[PDB]
Coordinates of C-alpha atoms and ligand atoms in Angstrom, one line a residue:
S1 CA 0.1 0.3 0.0
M2 CA 2.2 2.9 -1.8
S3 CA 0.5 6.6 0.2
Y4 CA 1.4 8.0 -2.7
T5 CA 1.3 7.4 -7.2
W6 CA 2.7 9.8 -9.0
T7 CA 2.8 10.6 -12.5
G8 CA 5.6 13.0 -13.7
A9 CA 3.2 16.0 -13.7
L10 CA 4.9 18.8 -11.4
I11 CA 3.0 20.5 -7.9
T12 CA 2.0 23.9 -9.8
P13 CA 1.8 27.6 -7.3
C14 CA -0.7 29.4 -8.6
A15 CA 1.0 32.1 -8.1
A16 CA 4.6 33.9 -7.6
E17 CA 6.2 32.8 -4.7
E18 CA 8.5 34.7 -2.8
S19 CA 11.3 33.1 -1.6
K20 CA 13.4 35.4 0.4
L21 CA 12.8 37.5 2.8
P22 CA 10.7 40.5 1.9
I23 CA 12.3 44.0 3.3
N24 CA 11.0 47.4 4.2
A25 CA 12.2 49.9 6.1
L26 CA 10.9 48.4 9.4
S27 CA 12.5 44.8 9.0
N28 CA 16.7 46.1 10.7
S29 CA 14.4 46.8 14.2
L30 CA 13.9 43.5 14.5
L31 CA 16.6 41.1 12.4
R32 CA 19.4 41.5 10.6
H33 CA 21.2 38.7 9.6
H34 CA 17.3 38.8 6.2
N35 CA 19.7 35.6 4.5
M36 CA 18.5 33.1 7.5
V37 CA 15.0 33.1 7.3
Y38 CA 13.1 31.8 4.2
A39 CA 9.9 30.4 2.7
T40 CA 8.6 27.1 1.7
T41 CA 7.8 27.2 -2.1
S42 CA 6.8 24.4 -5.1
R43 CA 10.8 24.4 -6.3
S44 CA 11.2 22.1 -3.4
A45 CA 7.8 19.8 -4.1
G46 CA 9.8 16.9 -5.5
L47 CA 12.1 16.5 -2.5
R48 CA 9.1 16.5 0.1
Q49 CA 7.1 13.5 -2.2
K50 CA 10.1 11.6 -1.9
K51 CA 10.2 11.9 1.9
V52 CA 6.2 11.0 2.0
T53 CA 6.1 8.3 -0.7
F54 CA 6.6 5.1 1.2
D55 CA 5.5 1.5 1.0
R56 CA 2.8 1.5 4.7
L57 CA 2.7 -2.3 7.2
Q58 CA 1.0 -2.5 9.0
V59 CA 0.2 -5.1 11.8
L60 CA -2.6 -5.5 14.4
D61 CA -2.8 -6.9 17.7
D62 CA -5.2 -7.8 20.4
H63 CA -4.2 -5.0 22.5
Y64 CA -5.5 -2.3 18.9
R65 CA -8.5 -3.9 18.7
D66 CA -9.4 -3.7 23.4
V67 CA -8.2 0.3 23.2
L68 CA -10.6 0.3 20.5
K69 CA -12.9 -1.0 21.9
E70 CA -13.2 1.4 24.7
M71 CA -13.2 4.2 22.6
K72 CA -15.8 3.0 20.1
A73 CA -18.2 2.6 23.7
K74 CA -17.2 5.5 24.8
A75 CA -18.2 7.2 21.1
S76 CA -21.8 5.4 20.8
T77 CA -22.8 8.1 23.7
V78 CA -21.8 10.5 21.6
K79 CA -24.9 12.8 19.8
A80 CA -24.6 14.3 17.1
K81 CA -26.3 16.6 14.4
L82 CA -26.5 17.8 10.7
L83 CA -25.8 21.0 10.4
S84 CA -27.7 23.4 7.7
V85 CA -26.2 24.5 4.1
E86 CA -26.8 28.4 6.3
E87 CA -24.4 27.0 9.5
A88 CA -21.7 24.8 7.0
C89 CA -21.4 29.0 4.9
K90 CA -21.2 30.6 8.3
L91 CA -18.0 28.8 9.4
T92 CA -16.5 29.0 5.9
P93 CA -14.0 31.6 5.8
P94 CA -14.0 34.2 3.9
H95 CA -10.6 34.0 1.5
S96 CA -11.2 30.5 1.1
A97 CA -10.3 29.3 -2.6
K98 CA -13.4 29.7 -4.9
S99 CA -16.0 26.6 -6.4
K100 CA -14.3 25.5 -9.9
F101 CA -18.7 25.5 -10.9
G102 CA -19.3 28.8 -10.9
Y103 CA -19.0 30.8 -7.4
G104 CA -16.6 32.3 -4.2
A105 CA -16.3 32.1 -1.0
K106 CA -18.3 35.4 -0.4
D107 CA -21.2 34.1 -1.8
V108 CA -21.4 31.4 0.2
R109 CA -21.2 33.7 3.0
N110 CA -24.1 36.0 2.1
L111 CA -25.7 32.7 0.8
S112 CA -26.6 33.0 -3.2
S113 CA -28.7 31.0 -5.1
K114 CA -25.9 29.9 -7.4
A115 CA -24.2 28.5 -4.4
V116 CA -26.8 27.4 -2.0
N117 CA -28.1 25.2 -5.1
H118 CA -24.7 23.7 -5.9
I119 CA -24.0 22.8 -2.6
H120 CA -27.4 20.8 -2.1
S121 CA -26.3 18.7 -5.7
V122 CA -22.8 17.9 -4.3
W123 CA -25.1 16.9 -0.9
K124 CA -27.5 14.8 -2.8
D125 CA -24.8 13.3 -4.6
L126 CA -23.1 11.7 -1.2
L127 CA -26.4 10.0 -0.8
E128 CA -26.9 9.0 -4.2
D129 CA -23.2 8.0 -4.8
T130 CA -20.4 5.4 -2.2
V131 CA -18.2 5.0 -4.9
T132 CA -16.7 8.0 -7.3
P133 CA -13.4 8.9 -6.2
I134 CA -14.1 13.5 -5.8
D135 CA -11.1 15.1 -6.9
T136 CA -8.9 17.2 -5.3
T137 CA -5.6 19.1 -5.6
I138 CA -2.6 19.1 -4.2
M139 CA -0.8 22.6 -3.0
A140 CA 2.8 23.4 -2.1
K141 CA 2.4 25.1 1.4
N142 CA 4.2 28.4 1.7
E143 CA 5.6 28.6 4.7
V144 CA 8.5 30.4 6.8
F145 CA 11.3 29.3 8.1
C146 CA 14.6 29.8 9.9
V147 CA 17.3 28.2 8.2
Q148 CA 19.0 25.0 10.6
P149 CA 21.9 23.4 9.7
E150 CA 22.0 19.4 9.9
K151 CA 18.2 19.6 9.6
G152 CA 19.7 19.2 5.7
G153 CA 19.2 23.3 6.1
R154 CA 16.1 23.8 4.4
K155 CA 13.2 21.6 5.5
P156 CA 11.3 20.8 2.0
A157 CA 7.4 22.7 1.2
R158 CA 4.5 20.4 3.2
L159 CA 1.5 19.0 0.6
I160 CA -1.6 20.4 1.1
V161 CA -4.4 18.4 -0.5
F162 CA -7.6 19.6 -0.4
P163 CA -11.8 19.1 -2.2
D164 CA -13.9 22.2 -3.5
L165 CA -15.6 24.5 -1.2
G166 CA -19.3 23.1 -2.5
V167 CA -17.3 19.6 -0.6
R168 CA -16.0 21.7 2.4
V169 CA -19.5 23.3 2.7
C170 CA -20.6 19.1 2.5
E171 CA -18.8 18.0 5.3
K172 CA -19.0 20.1 7.5
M173 CA -23.4 19.6 7.6
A174 CA -22.3 16.2 8.2
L175 CA -19.7 16.1 9.9
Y176 CA -18.6 19.1 12.0
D177 CA -20.8 18.5 14.9
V178 CA -19.1 15.3 15.0
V179 CA -15.6 16.6 14.9
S180 CA -15.9 19.3 18.2
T181 CA -17.8 16.9 20.1
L182 CA -16.2 13.6 20.6
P183 CA -12.7 13.6 19.7
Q184 CA -13.0 14.9 23.8
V185 CA -15.2 11.7 25.2
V186 CA -14.0 9.5 23.0
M187 CA -10.1 10.9 24.7
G188 CA -11.0 12.5 27.9
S189 CA -8.6 14.0 29.5
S190 CA -5.4 12.8 26.4
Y191 CA -8.2 15.9 24.1
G192 CA -5.2 18.7 23.2
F193 CA -7.5 20.8 22.1
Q194 CA -10.0 21.2 24.9
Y195 CA -7.0 23.3 27.1
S196 CA -6.4 26.6 26.3
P197 CA -1.9 27.6 27.1
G198 CA -3.1 28.1 31.2
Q199 CA -5.5 25.1 30.5
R200 CA -2.5 22.4 29.1
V201 CA 0.4 23.2 31.5
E202 CA -1.9 22.6 34.5
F203 CA -2.9 19.3 33.0
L204 CA 1.0 18.3 32.8
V205 CA 2.2 19.9 35.2
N206 CA -0.2 18.5 37.5
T207 CA 0.6 14.6 35.6
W208 CA 4.1 15.3 36.6
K209 CA 3.9 16.6 40.3
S210 CA 0.6 12.8 40.5
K211 CA 3.6 11.2 39.6
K212 CA 6.5 9.1 42.6
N213 CA 8.7 9.6 40.7
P214 CA 8.0 11.2 36.7
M215 CA 9.6 10.3 33.6
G216 CA 8.2 11.9 30.8
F217 CA 8.5 11.5 26.8
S218 CA 7.6 13.0 23.2
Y219 CA 7.1 10.4 20.3
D220 CA 7.9 11.8 17.0
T221 CA 6.5 10.5 13.9
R222 CA 8.0 10.3 10.1
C223 CA 6.0 12.0 8.3
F224 CA 2.6 11.1 9.7
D225 CA -0.2 11.9 7.7
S226 CA 1.7 9.5 4.8
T227 CA 1.7 6.6 8.2
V228 CA -2.2 7.0 7.6
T229 CA -4.0 4.0 6.3
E230 CA -7.0 3.6 4.8
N231 CA -8.4 0.7 7.3
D232 CA -7.2 4.0 9.9
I233 CA -9.0 6.1 8.3
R234 CA -12.2 3.0 8.1
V235 CA -11.5 3.1 11.8
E236 CA -12.0 6.6 12.0
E237 CA -15.3 6.0 10.2
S238 CA -16.5 3.2 12.5
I239 CA -16.0 5.5 15.6
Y240 CA -17.2 7.9 13.6
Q241 CA -21.0 5.6 12.8
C242 CA -20.7 4.9 17.2
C243 CA -22.6 8.7 17.5
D244 CA -25.9 9.0 17.4
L245 CA -27.1 10.1 13.9
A246 CA -29.2 10.5 11.2
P247 CA -29.6 8.2 9.2
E248 CA -28.6 10.9 6.3
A249 CA -25.7 12.0 8.7
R250 CA -24.9 8.4 8.2
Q251 CA -25.1 8.0 4.8
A252 CA -23.4 11.2 4.1
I253 CA -20.1 10.5 6.8
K254 CA -20.2 6.9 4.3
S255 CA -19.8 8.6 1.0
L256 CA -17.4 10.8 2.3
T257 CA -15.2 8.3 3.7
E258 CA -15.2 5.7 0.8
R259 CA -14.8 9.3 -1.7
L260 CA -12.8 11.3 -0.1
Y261 CA -10.9 10.2 3.2
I262 CA -9.2 7.4 2.3
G263 CA -7.9 8.8 -1.2
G264 CA -8.5 9.9 -4.8
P265 CA -7.1 11.7 -7.2
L266 CA -4.6 14.4 -7.3
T267 CA -4.8 17.6 -9.3
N268 CA -2.4 20.4 -9.9
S269 CA -3.0 23.9 -10.0
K270 CA -3.2 23.9 -14.2
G271 CA -6.0 21.2 -14.0
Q272 CA -3.3 18.1 -14.4
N273 CA -3.1 14.9 -12.5
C274 CA -0.4 14.7 -9.9
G275 CA -0.6 10.9 -9.2
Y276 CA -2.9 9.3 -6.5
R277 CA -3.7 9.4 -3.0
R278 CA -3.9 6.7 -0.1
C279 CA -3.2 8.9 3.1
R280 CA -3.9 11.0 4.7
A281 CA -5.6 14.2 3.4
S282 CA -4.1 17.8 4.9
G283 CA -7.0 19.7 4.1
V284 CA -10.5 18.5 4.9
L285 CA -12.2 18.2 7.9
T286 CA -11.6 15.8 9.8
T287 CA -7.9 16.2 9.3
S288 CA -7.5 16.8 13.5
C289 CA -10.0 14.7 14.4
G290 CA -8.8 11.7 12.7
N291 CA -5.2 12.3 13.0
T292 CA -6.1 12.4 16.2
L293 CA -7.8 9.6 17.5
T294 CA -5.5 7.6 15.1
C295 CA -2.6 8.3 17.1
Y296 CA -4.5 9.0 20.1
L297 CA -5.1 4.3 19.5
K298 CA -1.9 3.7 18.1
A299 CA -0.5 4.8 21.6
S300 CA -2.4 3.6 23.9
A301 CA -2.2 -0.2 22.4
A302 CA 1.5 1.2 22.1
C303 CA 1.8 2.2 26.0
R304 CA -0.1 -1.2 27.0
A305 CA 3.1 -3.5 24.4
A306 CA 5.3 -1.2 26.2
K307 CA 3.7 -2.4 30.3
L308 CA 4.3 1.8 30.9
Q309 CA 3.1 2.0 34.3
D310 CA 0.7 4.6 35.4
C311 CA 0.4 5.8 31.7
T312 CA -0.7 10.0 30.4
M313 CA -1.1 10.4 27.7
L314 CA -1.8 14.1 25.6
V315 CA -2.5 13.9 22.0
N316 CA -3.1 16.9 19.4
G317 CA -3.1 15.4 16.0
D318 CA 0.3 13.6 15.4
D319 CA 1.6 15.2 18.3
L320 CA 2.0 13.0 21.2
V321 CA 3.7 13.7 24.9
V322 CA 3.4 10.6 27.3
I323 CA 4.2 11.1 31.4
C324 CA 4.4 7.2 33.4
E325 CA 5.8 6.3 36.1
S326 CA 10.0 5.9 35.9
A327 CA 11.4 1.7 36.8
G328 CA 14.5 3.1 36.3
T329 CA 17.2 4.8 33.9
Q330 CA 18.0 0.8 32.3
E331 CA 14.1 -0.1 32.6
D332 CA 12.9 3.3 30.7
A333 CA 15.0 3.5 28.0
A334 CA 14.2 -0.8 27.8
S335 CA 9.9 0.4 27.7
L336 CA 10.4 3.2 25.3
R337 CA 12.2 0.4 22.6
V338 CA 9.5 -2.0 22.8
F339 CA 7.0 1.3 22.6
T340 CA 8.9 2.7 19.1
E341 CA 8.6 -1.4 18.0
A342 CA 4.6 -0.9 18.9
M343 CA 4.1 2.3 17.1
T344 CA 6.4 0.8 14.1
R345 CA 4.2 -2.6 14.0
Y346 CA 0.9 0.1 14.0
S347 CA 2.7 2.2 11.2
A348 CA 3.8 5.2 12.6
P349 CA 7.4 5.2 12.9
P350 CA 9.4 7.3 14.9
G351 CA 11.7 10.4 12.8
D352 CA 13.0 12.0 15.6
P353 CA 14.1 8.5 18.1
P354 CA 12.3 8.9 21.4
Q355 CA 14.2 10.0 24.5
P356 CA 13.4 10.0 28.7
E357 CA 13.5 12.6 30.4
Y358 CA 13.1 13.2 34.1
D359 CA 13.0 17.1 33.9
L360 CA 10.0 18.4 32.3
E361 CA 11.6 21.5 31.0
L362 CA 12.9 19.4 28.4
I363 CA 10.2 17.9 27.2
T364 CA 8.8 19.9 24.0
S365 CA 5.0 19.2 22.8
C366 CA 2.9 21.2 19.7
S367 CA 6.8 22.7 19.4
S368 CA 5.9 24.3 23.2
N369 CA 7.7 23.7 26.8
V370 CA 6.5 24.5 30.4
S371 CA 8.7 26.7 32.2
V372 CA 9.0 28.7 35.5
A373 CA 8.7 32.2 36.4
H374 CA 7.7 34.3 38.9
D375 CA 4.8 36.8 39.4
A376 CA 4.8 40.3 41.7
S377 CA 3.9 38.2 45.2
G378 CA 6.9 36.5 44.2
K379 CA 5.2 33.3 43.7
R380 CA 6.5 30.8 41.3
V381 CA 4.0 30.5 38.6
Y382 CA 4.1 28.0 35.1
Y383 CA 4.1 28.8 32.1
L384 CA 3.8 27.6 28.3
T385 CA 6.9 28.3 26.1
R386 CA 8.7 27.6 23.3
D387 CA 12.2 28.6 20.9
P388 CA 11.4 31.9 19.9
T389 CA 13.1 31.0 16.5
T390 CA 10.2 30.5 13.9
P391 CA 7.6 33.4 15.9
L392 CA 10.6 36.2 15.0
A393 CA 11.6 34.8 11.8
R394 CA 7.4 34.9 11.0
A395 CA 6.9 38.2 12.8
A396 CA 9.9 39.7 10.1
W397 CA 8.2 38.3 6.9
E398 CA 4.7 39.9 8.2
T399 CA 6.9 43.3 8.9
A400 CA 7.6 44.3 5.5
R401 CA 3.9 41.8 3.3
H402 CA 0.4 41.6 3.9
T403 CA -0.6 38.1 4.9
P404 CA -4.0 36.5 5.5
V405 CA -2.6 35.1 8.7
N406 CA -1.4 37.2 11.2
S407 CA 0.9 35.2 12.9
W408 CA 2.6 37.8 15.5
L409 CA -0.4 38.1 17.1
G410 CA -1.8 33.6 17.6
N411 CA 1.5 34.1 19.2
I412 CA 1.0 37.2 21.4
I413 CA -1.8 35.7 22.5
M414 CA -1.2 31.7 23.2
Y415 CA 2.7 32.5 24.5
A416 CA 0.8 36.0 26.3
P417 CA 3.8 35.4 29.6
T418 CA 6.7 34.9 27.3
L419 CA 10.0 36.9 27.8
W420 CA 10.4 36.6 23.9
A421 CA 6.2 37.6 22.9
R422 CA 6.5 40.5 26.2
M423 CA 9.8 42.0 25.3
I424 CA 10.1 42.3 21.4
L425 CA 6.9 40.8 19.1
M426 CA 4.3 42.7 21.1
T427 CA 6.8 46.4 21.1
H428 CA 7.4 45.7 17.5
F429 CA 3.9 45.3 16.5
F430 CA 2.2 47.9 18.9
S431 CA 4.9 50.7 17.5
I432 CA 3.7 49.8 13.7
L433 CA -0.1 49.7 14.9
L434 CA 0.9 53.2 16.7
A435 CA 2.6 54.4 13.3
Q436 CA -0.5 53.2 10.7
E437 CA -2.9 54.3 13.4
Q438 CA -4.1 51.3 13.2
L439 CA -4.7 49.6 16.2
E440 CA -8.7 49.4 16.0
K441 CA -8.6 47.2 12.6
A442 CA -9.3 43.9 12.7
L443 CA -6.8 41.2 11.9
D444 CA -7.1 37.4 11.0
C445 CA -5.0 35.1 12.3
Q446 CA -5.5 30.6 13.0
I447 CA -6.0 29.7 17.2
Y448 CA -5.9 25.6 17.0
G449 CA -7.0 25.6 13.0
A450 CA -9.6 27.8 13.2
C451 CA -9.7 31.4 11.8
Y452 CA -10.3 33.8 14.1
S453 CA -10.6 38.0 13.3
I454 CA -8.9 40.1 16.5
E455 CA -9.2 43.0 17.8
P456 CA -5.1 43.9 18.8
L457 CA -7.3 46.7 21.5
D458 CA -8.8 43.3 23.1
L459 CA -5.4 41.6 24.0
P460 CA -4.8 42.8 27.5
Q461 CA -8.8 41.3 28.1
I462 CA -8.0 37.9 26.1
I463 CA -4.7 37.6 28.3
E464 CA -6.1 38.2 31.3
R465 CA -8.9 35.5 30.4
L466 CA -6.4 32.9 29.6
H467 CA -3.2 33.5 31.4
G468 CA -4.6 35.7 34.4
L469 CA -3.6 38.9 35.4
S470 CA -0.3 37.1 36.8
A471 CA 1.1 37.5 32.4
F472 CA 2.1 41.1 33.2
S473 CA 3.4 40.4 35.7
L474 CA 6.1 37.6 35.3
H475 CA 9.9 37.6 35.9
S476 CA 12.9 36.1 37.1
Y477 CA 13.1 33.9 34.2
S478 CA 14.5 30.4 34.2
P479 CA 18.1 30.1 32.5
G480 CA 16.9 27.7 30.7
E481 CA 15.5 30.1 28.7
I482 CA 17.2 33.1 29.6
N483 CA 20.3 31.2 27.5
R484 CA 17.9 30.2 24.1
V485 CA 16.5 33.9 23.5
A486 CA 19.8 35.1 24.0
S487 CA 20.4 32.0 21.8
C488 CA 18.5 32.9 19.1
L489 CA 18.6 36.2 19.3
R490 CA 22.2 36.0 18.0
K491 CA 21.3 33.1 15.3
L492 CA 18.9 36.3 14.0
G493 CA 20.7 40.0 14.9
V494 CA 17.9 40.9 16.9
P495 CA 18.8 43.7 18.9
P496 CA 19.2 43.0 22.4
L497 CA 16.4 43.1 24.8
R498 CA 17.7 46.0 26.8
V499 CA 17.5 47.5 23.8
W500 CA 13.4 46.4 23.5
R501 CA 13.1 47.5 27.1
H502 CA 13.9 51.0 25.6
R503 CA 11.7 51.5 22.8
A504 CA 8.5 49.7 24.9
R505 CA 8.5 52.6 27.8
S506 CA 8.5 54.7 24.5
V507 CA 5.5 52.3 22.7
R508 CA 3.8 52.2 26.4
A509 CA 4.1 56.3 26.5
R510 CA 2.2 56.5 23.3
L511 CA -0.3 54.5 23.4
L512 CA -1.5 55.9 27.2
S513 CA -1.4 59.1 26.0
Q514 CA -3.7 57.5 23.1
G515 CA -6.3 56.4 25.9
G516 CA -9.6 54.8 25.6
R517 CA -8.3 50.4 25.1
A518 CA -5.1 51.8 24.0
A519 CA -4.2 53.3 27.3
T520 CA -5.0 49.9 28.4
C521 CA -2.9 48.4 26.8
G522 CA -0.2 50.3 27.7
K523 CA -0.9 50.4 31.0
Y524 CA -1.2 45.9 31.3
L525 CA 1.1 44.8 28.1
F526 CA 4.2 46.9 29.3
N527 CA 4.2 47.0 33.4
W528 CA 7.7 45.2 32.0
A529 CA 8.5 48.0 31.0
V530 CA 9.0 50.8 33.9
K531 CA 10.6 50.5 36.9
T532 CA 8.2 51.8 39.1
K533 CA 5.5 49.1 38.3
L534 CA 1.4 50.3 38.6
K535 CA -1.1 48.1 40.5
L536 CA -2.5 46.3 37.8
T537 CA -6.9 45.0 38.3
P538 CA -9.7 43.0 36.5
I539 CA -10.5 44.5 33.1
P540 CA -14.9 45.0 32.7
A541 CA -15.3 44.2 29.1
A542 CA -13.4 40.8 29.7
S543 CA -16.2 39.2 30.3
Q544 CA -18.3 40.0 27.5
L545 CA -15.8 38.8 24.6
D546 CA -17.5 35.4 23.6
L547 CA -13.7 33.3 24.2
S548 CA -16.0 30.3 23.9
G549 CA -15.0 27.5 21.0
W550 CA -10.9 28.7 21.3
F551 CA -10.8 25.7 22.7
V552 CA -13.0 23.0 22.4
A553 CA -11.6 21.1 19.2
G554 CA -8.8 20.8 16.2
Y555 CA -9.4 21.9 13.4
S556 CA -6.0 22.8 11.2
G557 CA -6.6 22.2 7.2
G558 CA -10.9 21.8 7.8
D559 CA -11.4 25.0 5.5
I560 CA -13.3 26.4 9.2
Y561 CA -13.6 30.5 10.1
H562 CA -15.1 31.5 13.8
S563 CA -16.5 34.8 13.5
Ligands
77Z601 C1 -0.7 23.9 22.5 C2 -0.6 25.3 22.2 C3 -1.1 25.6 23.9 C4 0.7 26.2 22.1 C5 1.5 26.3 20.6 N1 0.3 25.5 19.3 C6 -0.3 25.2 19.0 O1 -0.1 23.8 19.2 C7 -1.3 24.8 17.9 C8 -2.5 24.2 17.0 N2 -2.0 22.4 18.0 C9 -1.4 21.8 16.5 C10 -0.9 20.2 16.9 C11 -0.9 19.8 16.2 C12 -1.6 19.7 14.8 O2 -1.7 18.5 14.3 C13 -2.8 18.1 13.0 C14 -2.4 17.2 12.5 N3 -3.4 17.3 11.3 O3 -1.4 16.5 12.7 C15 -2.1 20.2 14.4 C16 -2.2 22.2 15.6 S1 -2.9 23.3 15.2 O4 -4.4 22.9 15.6 O5 -3.1 23.8 14.2 N4 -2.4 24.7 15.8 C17 -2.2 26.1 17.1 O6 -2.4 26.6 16.6 C18 -1.0 27.8 18.0 C19 -1.3 29.1 17.6 C20 -0.6 30.2 18.0 C21 0.4 29.7 19.7 C22 1.0 28.5 19.6 C23 0.3 27.6 19.1

């Protein structure tokens, strides 16, 4: 069973692709070593194709079937509803790719006769036909990274595979409720997407402390989407079908599974046949839910095979971390080899070889790790951080280019308590917003794969709600964290933190002069900058903002808009 077969036709871009970091008058203030930042293009698609194309062997034992039975029993308690055409239409992003059948995303959102009637026709076809493969478009992703020597230096572009807009709206009708509600029921506390950043830290810290002698490890599956087999996708559907569903929903789900999710023909941007997929499509509604379930199933069974004691898992898509009871250094090493052997048999072999870790702060999961700082009272506060290299490289790109998704805003929200987000990201971008008088302008960014329109003036309310008032007063960061940030700044040629402190005093003063919500941004987001701090009190506007739906489920690749 080959993950892909290829015709020879190239993966083509839809427009001009930039690989070199764009530079304007503002670039140098953030980053000096411009040659270190690059974007992935279709020119490296061939290299990705070779990496993602392989034979999958699967050997399924009693542990696997045992866990599946338990998952199905939980799934059987879920009652899910079909979305109406209108409800599905409103979940479509305004700038989502247009249909090849004579309408765009804005037509869908406006409930135009042409769009709605076509969607009805696609739905009718799904109910009637459960065999005919549905067309997909294959594209190379344009993503910004910093060069990383020993990784081959530069990573090839990721492959995105997605069906037509009409099909995407139909996916929503059939499965939006399922993928939003089922994962937490089946996986419980192990489902990562139910957690805000602070809630994730809470879960990780509490889990670590619950063990007598804790040991943890992240498990990196090599090219997870390609490891997903027809079996896996059919198993996922069987889980979905355990739900209390309308007969209509059951038919649509069965059809989508057979015709889209299991595999299908690949078409480039020019309309040429590129080949065939027999693995996970990155750009469907069930991608996040399917991957989390599949990873959870394989990992749970692998934990049993390895006889891991008092196991606790945390799963987000392909991203897996396990915390358990240590049996000793040699014993743990042996246990992880058995775990890896089990995962490999299930068709989930490792990329990075898994290693036991006895320091929670050194465990990276969802590209992030738990670190410790101190609040204004001097009390230890745990928070989520990461290596700032990619965030800052993407911030550099967004400084000189308008982008659909503003990664900097998402990074400020999710990493608000961090040294680097506060000192660099907040300072840099609020200065930009002040200069253009664009503080009031709402910006698009993605949280857990879903698109949100967010006003930067709401940041103090957002940060207070998610991270607490402590996020505005954190100090005395860990030596490891300080060292990592320092290494990043040297690498990228970012001005030292002392320069950022000086700049922040100016940014703060400007914001305070503006009045209104801008003054609140100055007071709260930049209280770290001044030597004599203010009191900091709860914001009345914070409880008014609707933050439900932010941390319920993952929707990466699912074409989801929540506003
Ligand atoms: C864990 C989280 C609190 C911190 C890291 N983080 C994240 O993990 C995500 C995120 N997580 C995640 C993990 C795994 C994942 O796998 C999807 C797959 N199909 O394998 C997809 C996602 S996401 O939903 O695309 N986004 C994210 O969107 C994000 C955005 C801004 C800032 C931080 C983010």
